Symmetry: C3
Subunit: 155 residues, 3 copies
């Protein structure tokens, strides 16, 4: 059946704090795997109609070593958006995150966000991840990832 | 099969820090959907025996614009409860949240909670959502919601 | 079909700001259930090949009355590690948590982490839960737990 568990590809990540779309994932190394669905530039396309469970885990971390956060109070957000090739429309399925104060002398800072839900998806619909502060992302495969798996055929 | 994904219905929502129940959800608009189960005043009633995966996502936001938090350090909590007929006692299945300090001249504030789990549910049982500070809820369907779906037939 | 939903057993728990493995769980009392898979010292061992959805929920809490906090900035982390019989070496599957400041003041402090994912598991593999500051764990079964359940046969 259709499913996917993609892990962050640190090698490519735009610096900044702007809400961006992460488009570098692995589908073969470690826990990364993908059956049926295809991965097109960080976009997880659906090739089979059905009701899937979509989930994402995003880890953020700051180490004084890397320098200092670009702002005392910052927004650590994750957005699970859905697009389509058949239609240029865009939609948010899930949102999660929180504003966190990483100002000070605390040597280390960390914060993760989880999010999931049951959704109805049509072949052609694409799923992508949007986050803020992508420079603060934890690159480990067990820290940052998102995926999906079909539960039952569509009505 | 049986499943459900319900999105918060802001129009019908009170206030106060005390832990209240959310009885206003959609089941037809946008991602809101429901199959088999029934939506009775925020009480998702089961209509079939089996193992369901129960999940919920509650977003919270605030801006000093509205003065300051009720109590400097406030508690943002979500409780997934199941009220059964074979003995009408409110039972807690899952709990998540945290204490945050949004008081004082502050910027915008946001924080989300996600909870989920595998459970055994007998036809007739009802699932509801209880939260504190419901006045700080995020109305968007991609921020506040909850649901469930059948995984495998029961023993 | 295989599946499990383990709740914390507050009975046997040490104390210390170090990453330790939790080896005390229930599989009968309340929501605690386990099918096929076995529970051996907090090590959920798989007895059937396949794709399972692994998840966990950990609640942390502290009240000023219980004394004083280990420091200022403490790490509340959770780890869903997998150990192979072929090689007891530890592999992280999922990670979550955050660095929280519970010093200074405030009556109560609470914070939960949630993490979930879809994984490929071979029979004889063991899934365990590691956390930091286990002395701050919330003993209630709806506040601390972790489970697993098969979604589809393996390739």
């Amino acid at each position: 059946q259709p499913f996917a568990h993609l892990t962050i590809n640190a090698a490519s990540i735009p610096s900044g704090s702007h809400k961006v779309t992460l488009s570098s994932w692995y589908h073969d190394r470690g826990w990364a795997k993908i059956s049926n669905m295809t991965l097109s530039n960080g976009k997880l396309r659906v090739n089979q109609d059905g009701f899937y469970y979509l989930y994402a885990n995003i880890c953020f971390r700051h180490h004084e070593t890397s320098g200092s956060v670009p702002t005392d109070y910052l927004q650590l957000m994750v957005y699970v958006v859905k697009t389509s090739i058949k239609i240029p429309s865009s939609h948010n399925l899930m949102k999660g995150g929180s504003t966190k104060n990483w100002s000070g002398n605390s040597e280390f800072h960390f914060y993760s966000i989880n999010v999931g839900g049951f959704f109805k998806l049509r072949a052609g619909e694409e799923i992508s991840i949007q986050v803020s502060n992508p420079s603060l992302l934890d690159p480990d495969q067990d820290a940052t990832y998102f995926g999906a798996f079909k539960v039952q055929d569509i009505d």
